[PDB]
Design a protein around this ligand. Structure first.
Ligand SMILES: Cc1ncc(Cc2csc(CCOP(=O)(O)OP(=O)(O)O)c2C)c(N)n1
Ligand SMILES: Cc1ncc(Cc2csc(CCOP(=O)(O)OP(=O)(O)O)c2C)c(N)n1
Ligand SMILES: [K+]
Ligand SMILES: [K+]
Ligand SMILES: [Mg+2]
Ligand SMILES: [Mg+2]
Ligand SMILES: [Mg+2]
Lengths: 42, 324, 365, 324, 365
């Protein structure tokens, strides 16, 4: 499935992004408030 | 057969007395009278004063008597009248029996099962309803069991009695005769340290024990009327916790709350939360919130209704996690 | 093989604790030289309090049955033991009662309505008026004993000419705290009066099952302090024994253990189903003559100090006061979580400050 | 002046005995002998036997004595020779004095301070070094203080004695004379329920108490060589916790661990972890892990060094959180 | 004003507990009536064991100062109290000792190296051989008393002609568990022998600060069981008293409390304790003439049953055995965390199964 700390998950939700379609650049594919930002981005 | 929780307990005790002649039952007013809540009624008549007997009014002596008997090959099943009186026998329990096997490197052991009622909602006098399970949950060498149904009680108690180490069996006052359930006749066992799912759910995980399991079921039933599917997990043993079952439920739902009748600074809820965070943090959609009582001494009888946590508090907390 | 004289030992210690009696079942003085100096009015008020307390028990049992009271431990039969002992105390004396020793703290200054609030379970019921020297009824059997050794020591250190009096039952004598309490008071030579109310039962458990000691008063021997066994159904014997222990105490000679031999006519408690837990039907019938009110009534009537009209007036005074107290209790405002929070500490710790705010929001909406 | 922790303890007591006539010190061998660790040395000689005295050997009786003396206006400061003997006096502590203000609705109060040593590292016999702070921390109505330095010990003890409610003051055996520290002369207090920063850090929050503070500081100094900036927080009161300070540090670092000498199922680390996971779950970048002792009975003397958590365990766990 | 005979009560009761003595300070028989039946070979053996134990103490203290032993509570001076009491027991009897009663359990079957391991702090020291009926020394004063009552009840229930015997000091008599222990055994008429070793001190605390009771043996009155005060420096007296109590207990007559009046020459423990902070020199020299070894040596010599040749042989045999025991303890493998985990439960719970793997990993290196 997917993996991200809760702060992240809640950033993605607040922002109407479905974190599940974002590519994390973290250990094991963990998505970071950094990937969501580069998504909100293009 | 349809049995109440106290009936299933009495049946379980009768099964052990019959099965194992080493099993002894003793404490304040448990013999001829059959106990304060009739949990031992008829047992002395069937097995004799040599197997089921009354003792002098002293919890510490009752604890030492159990330890001494265990050293002589017996399987002691003493009773502390109300868990609030545990303060009188904390040494025998925590400083002694919980440590015997360790203390003697296996040379001696304590196949002891301590039965004791607790829990509120019945307007009992002072120090009768207090939840002090969180104390004994902190002592290595003990297993603490808290059933919520007649079926769990019978099976768990039988397991507790057969278990060759000290087991504290906590019986909630409000659950003794609150309802009936189909309980198989004859002996059967339920593993200690194993939780079960009282209600399958997919949106939120509700962890609870004791009388809070029913409250969690009521809340879940109400949440469902709004499309909120709650999974209610009954711990059934609070030490050791069933990590595999807890984490499994939390990982599936992504949201979780822990509900206990004990004060926030007490109980075992903090331990559950800490374990969930440690093992399933990156599966959490929100923080694991706790439903617990105010950090005051257990309330004077009249104030139970407003002080004790209930299904409405579980609903409110559950929705707070859903909307986080 | 050599034999120690243990049977002799047991017999010799027994001889040191004979039953202290002043009035027999017929109200006759059987011990004239132990007679306490009480005036006619004092004698009349003691009887007034015993009759009052008897009525208090009837009404308490009834109200509890009507759901208008909560936890209650019947007292009928122990009037001499409970009331005549308290009648020997002074305002400055400090009482540490058990769960069944409510009548004592009431006569010592605790309003009746507050005693009813204790039964129901309301914090206000335990808010003893300032200047009144009592603790709320202790449910932990034996705890009042070690705390008593502490209170008595406090009085001693302050130089106060007062005593700490505490009560427990036959069953409670088996507790460690019972022993520790009387041993500490002895070691510190403290002004404490330890009273043991022996009715032969500790709920369902007879006294022979508590200990093999033939008397409970002899337990004072282990603490090295004097012990007295008295007819707990005799107001004069009880009063005289407590008076004698108080004088000894206020003179700095230490504590005393008093075993009162009595019998209760009611159930253990009103907590179900105790009120019908048994009960023995014939064992009670011969204790109907031993009733403290019976012998003390005859004792006063032969002295032309009592009459059935005077007794009826007391009963009427009790009933009226009992209804206004139960009524005053009903009017007391319900408990809020914030109330319970506010009484935990002088200064609330961080966790309570938060929760206080949480529960204030819930109590305002 | 430069004082050891025991010297600070004694100074604090000396100051209270002098400034407040109601202060009384009592317990087993605390008088002429001056305590087993000399914490009460010279006090009886200076203030008299009526204020500093020995008692018969009965912990429960000692607790009941403090309760009664408090009802007569005294400010009792009793001692329990080793906190492992707390099982003998649990009712007086948890079922009584902690509940008096509540039980009496404010009419009576318990200005009691119970001193008691604990902690391992000095090869004591059984039930001497056990960490049982987790039991009393679960009881509403009590405050539990555990200093790690002479300066803290003196200030917190003075505050403890002044506080009009029960405070349990735990003194770590190993820290009594481990090192000297500058301690101000005269009366000065330190707020109860207030933690402090032992080492200001930026990468991870190390939370500890007792002897684990030195192990944390020692560990932080080594983590610096590895480019890890660790902030050490000394709780200094474990009940209540200083939420403000704990959370502020975690909001800055985003990573935390809790270190205790007590068994994993005991202590107060779980409660600390549960509070962080709830209040700052939005500032967490890694799960809050715990450094604790194995879940066995306190180790036989010779097994202390391999059982007791130390600075190397804090190193290993801190790095585990950083590399998450 | 009426007065109760409190003084007469205290005197008469204490009078029922006179010091029991067989051999005086000079080795002279003062009570041939109570002389225990002991063959010349048994008399020798008892002396050998008392001499052996003296050397053990001397050797243990030395070893502790060398850092070879850990926790040690000296025994010198209590040889009669500890050894002669044990000399009256049988293999089947169960001993529940305290921290200072290591000698009793050694002679009852605990190998000397395991006794030293207990001192150091190794779980194997407590791994008592099967069939040896003892528990490791109890560190919680009083705990052994309530456990002893249970053990005694167990023996009684299985119908075994054996007794449970336990030991505590003067200080321990103030504990609640001490009183609950003797009371429970009395209530259940259990075969238990309760020994109170009164060496006058509870650490720094003199026995007068513990209680105002004239004797400690009289504390049995509280439980309703027989009590005996004996000269704890007299081997024959201690033996005789315990043998009688054993005979009485196996015959199903219940428990007995025995107070031995003894004295220890060493410090309370071997860590910090300094005797010169609470006791006098003109008090230590007195009990030196009362030394159990002295009077018994003269008693045996007058019978031509003892000599300095035999005594020196026992002394050297003791040293050689201490030598091998300390070596065997040093050779015991060190404890691993996995060892302590494995001995926690029969079948480990989840939390321990995990931790077991963690430390099993760490121990591999
Ligand atoms: C430490 C503790 N353990 C058990 C109980 C439970 C109990 C409440 S009442 C009672 C019987 C007491 O009999 P006693 O003869 O002592 O007193 P009396 O009622 O006047 O006949 C028990 C065992 C309590 N309250 N505390
Ligand atoms: C429940 C508890 N509280 C305090 C202590 C601490 C202690 C260990 S030894 C001792 C003195 C006891 O002297 P006693 O005369 O009883 O025995 P003896 O040493 O042979 O002279 C104390 C206070 C322990 N171990 N357990
Ligand atoms: K068991
Ligand atoms: K305080
Ligand atoms: Mg006790
Ligand atoms: Mg009774
Ligand atoms: Mg001693």
């Amino acid at each position: 499935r997917v993996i991200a700390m809760p702060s992240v998950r809640k950033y993605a939700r607040e922002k109407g992004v479905d974190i599940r379609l974002v590519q994390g650049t973290g250990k094991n594919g963990r998505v970071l408030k950094e990937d969501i930002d580069a998504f909100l981005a293009g | 057969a349809q049995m109440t929780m106290v009936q299933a307990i009495t049946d379980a005790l009768r099964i052990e007395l019959k099965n194992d002649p080493n099993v002894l039952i003793f404490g304040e007013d448990v013999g001829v009278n059959g106990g304060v809540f009739r949990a031992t009624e008829g047992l002395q008549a069937e097995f004799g004063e040599d197997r089921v007997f009354d003792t002098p009014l002293a919890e510490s002596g009752i604890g030492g008597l159990a330890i001494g008997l265990a050293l002589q090959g017996f399987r002691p099943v003493p009773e502390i009248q109300f868990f609030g009186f545990v303060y009188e026998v904390m040494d025998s329990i925590c400083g002694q029996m919980a440590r015997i096997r360790y203390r003697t490197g296996g040379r001696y052991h304590m196949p002891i099962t301590i039965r004791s009622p607790f829990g509120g909602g019945v307007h009992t006098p002072e120090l009768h309803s207090d939840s002090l399970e969180g104390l004994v949950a902190q002592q290595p060498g003990l297993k603490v069991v808290i059933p919520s149904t007649p079926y769990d009680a019978k099976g768990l108690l039988i397991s507790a009695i057969r278990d060759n180490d000290p087991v504290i069996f906590l019986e909630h006052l409000k659950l003794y005769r609150s309802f009936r359930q189909e309980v198989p006749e004859g002996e059967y066992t339920i593993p200690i340290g194993k939780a079960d799912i009282k209600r399958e759910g997919k949106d939120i995980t509700i962890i609870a024990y004791g009388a809070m399991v029913h409250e969690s079921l009521k809340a879940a039933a109400e949440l469902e009327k709004e499309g909120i599917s709650a999974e209610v997990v009954d711990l059934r043993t609070v030490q050791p916790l069933d990590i595999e079952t807890i984490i499994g439920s939390v990982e599936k739902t992504g949201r979780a709350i822990v509900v206990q009748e004990a004060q926030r600074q007490a109980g075992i809820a903090a331990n559950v939360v800490a374990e969930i965070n440690e093992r399933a943090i990156l599966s959490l959609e929100a923080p694991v919130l706790r439903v617990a009582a105010p950090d005051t001494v257990y309330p004077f009888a009249q104030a139970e209704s407003v002080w004790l946590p209930n299904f409405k508090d579980v609903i409110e907390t559950a929705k707070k996690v859903m909307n986080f | 093989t050599f034999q120690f004289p243990f049977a002799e030992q047991l017999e010799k210690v027994a001889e040191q604790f004979p039953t202290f009696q002043i009035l027999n079942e017929e109200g006759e003085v059987v011990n004239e030289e132990a007679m306490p100096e009480l005036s006619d009015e004092q004698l009349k008020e003691l009887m007034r309090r015993m009759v009052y307390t008897r009525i208090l028990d009837q009404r308490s049992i009834s109200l509890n049955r009507q759901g208008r009271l909560g936890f209650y431990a019947p007292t009928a039969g122990q009037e001499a033991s409970q009331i005549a002992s308290h009648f020997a105390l002074e305002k400055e004396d400090f009482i540490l009662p058990g769960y069944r020793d409510v009548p004592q703290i009431i006569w010592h200054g605790l309003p009746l309505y507050q005693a009813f609030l204790f039964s129901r379970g309301h914090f206000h019921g335990n808010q003893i008026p300032e200047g009144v020297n009592v603790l709320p009824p202790q449910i932990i059997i034996g705890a009042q004993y070690i705390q008593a050794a502490g209170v008595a020591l406090g009085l001693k250190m302050r130089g106060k000419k007062a005593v700490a009096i505490t009560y427990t039952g036959d069953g409670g004598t088996s507790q460690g705290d019972f022993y520790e309490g009387i041993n500490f008071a002895g070691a510190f030579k403290a002004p404490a009066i330890f009273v043991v109310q022996n009715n032969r039962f500790a709920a369902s458990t007879p006294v022979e099952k508590q200990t093999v000691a033939k008397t409970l008063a002899q337990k004072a021997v282990a603490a090295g302090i004097p012990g007295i066994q008295v007819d707990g159904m005799d107001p004069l014997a009880v009063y005289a024994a407590v008076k004698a222990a108080r004088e000894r105490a206020i003179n700095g000679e230490g504590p005393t253990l008093i075993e009162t031999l009595c019998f209760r006519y009611g159930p253990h408690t009103m907590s179900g189903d105790d009120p019908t837990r048994y009960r023995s039907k014939e064992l009670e019938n011969e204790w109907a003559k031993k009733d403290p009110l019976v012998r003390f009534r005859k004792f006063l009537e032969a002295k032309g100090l009592w009459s059935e009209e005077e007794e009826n007036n007391v009963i009427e005074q009790a009933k009226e006061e009992i209804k206004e107290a139960i009524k005053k209790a009903d009017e007391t405002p319900k408990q809020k979580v914030t109330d319970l929070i506010s009484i935990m500490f002088e200064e609330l710790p961080f966790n309570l400050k938060e929760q206080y705010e949480i529960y204030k929001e819930k109590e305002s909406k």
